[PDB]
Write a protein that binds this ligand. Structure first.
Ligand code: CA9
Length: 253
């Protein structure tokens, strides 16, 4: 009884652009990782030791800064993002940066051992590594829950890039000027996503995937708020900005 409208020429183009944007901004071999400040793993088996050392912070801060640069690159290739004022472009990028990083990290996340595997042994990131970077389990546990839940959706790469774009272009972000434009750009992306699922995703017996995808966006909202709280506490540690990057400092500070 549910209508299945075909993907329009513009919608097929939008997907093509977004897939191409992602392949230009996501290296699945993670060959740049060795250029970061080296990962250090001291035995913790302690929140006092954690903040004392912050051993994994320089590496992960470089990982996040690098990721932010890629997201910016990805955003500029999103259809519509061009038409926005640069002031609205920054607003959207700053408030969605950590959300989109959590999204795009799912391509490296594996349910083999519940880790982010970016090769090879050194660049395998477990729960203990994130703690060693000065974050508590209040963020880390729900983050893994999110990643696992997202993995089980078995998203097509077409859906994965669309979801990242919808995430970035959000009219309900604190500080937006032209919310109607952002809403129009998001509607264009959402409609393409809704059409694609009904068209391309099998069987389809339960097209209830879209509602599950919108739920993931809300999961990101609360994760964003929790990371924000924990970042503020990390920044209280003396000589902490040293371990971060000017870009990470601007986005979260
Ligand atoms: C490069 C690809 C993608 O961009 C993200 C990846 C990742 C990852 C991550 C692996 C371990 C946890 C993270 C460090 C990131 C993603 C978000 C996590 C935390 C909460 C961010 C903390 C930031 C700060 C220390 C400044 O507070 C791997 C690849 O899939």
């Amino acid at each position: 009884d549910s209508l299945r409208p075909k993907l329009s020429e513009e919608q097929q183009r939008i997907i093509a652009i977004l897939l191409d944007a992602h392949h230009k901004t996501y290296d699945p071999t993670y060959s740049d990782f060795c250029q970061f400040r080296p990962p250090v793993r001291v035995n913790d088996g302690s929140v006092t030791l954690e903040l004392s050392q912050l051993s994994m912070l320089p590496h992960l801060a470089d990982l996040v800064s690098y990721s932010i640069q890629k997201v910016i690159g990805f955003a500029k290739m999103i259809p519509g993002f061009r038409d926005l004022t640069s002031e609205d472009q920054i607003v959207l990028l700053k408030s969605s940066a950590i959300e989109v990083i959590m999204l795009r990290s799912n391509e490296s996340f594996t349910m083999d051992d519940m880790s982010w595997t970016c090769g090879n042994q050194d660049y395998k990131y477990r729960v203990s590594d994130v703690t060693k970077a000065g974050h508590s389990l209040e963020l880390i546990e729900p983050l893994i829950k999110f990643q696992v839940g997202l993995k089980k959706l078995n998203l097509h790469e077409e859906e994965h890039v669309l979801l990242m774009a919808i995430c970035i272009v959000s009219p309900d972000r604190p500080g937006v000027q032209d919310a109607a434009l952002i809403e129009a750009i998001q509607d264009r992306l959402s409609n393409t996503l809704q059409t694609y699922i009904r068209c391309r995703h099998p069987p389809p017996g339960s097209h209830l995937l879209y509602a599950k995808m919108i739920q993931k966006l809300a999961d990101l909202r609360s994760l964003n708020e929790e990371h924000s709280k924990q970042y503020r506490c990390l920044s209280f540690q003396p000589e902490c900005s040293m371990k971060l990057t000017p870009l990470v400092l601007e986005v979260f500070g």
